Amino acid sequence: LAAALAQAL
Ligand SMILES: *C(=O)c1ccc(-c2ccc(C(=O)OCC)cn2)nc1
Numbered sequence: 051l052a053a054a055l056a057q058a059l
């Protein structure tokens with residue numbers, strides 16, 4: 051989950 055969002059960065 052964290053990674054899925056973190057792609058923005
Ligand atoms: C939430 O974005 C997210 C994405 C991907 C994963 C995840 C966990 C584990 C692996 C893996 O290769 O484990 C090997 C033991 C890959 N991707 N978790 C949470």
Ligand SMILES: *NNC(=O)c1ccc(-c2ccc(C(N)=O)cn2)nc1
Pocket residue numbers: 056057058059
């Ligand atoms: N928000 N994330 C990025 O801007 C980003 C993170 C990681 C990477 C990237 C690209 C290529 C490799 C590799 N060849 O191992 C690893 N990580 N790009 C962009």
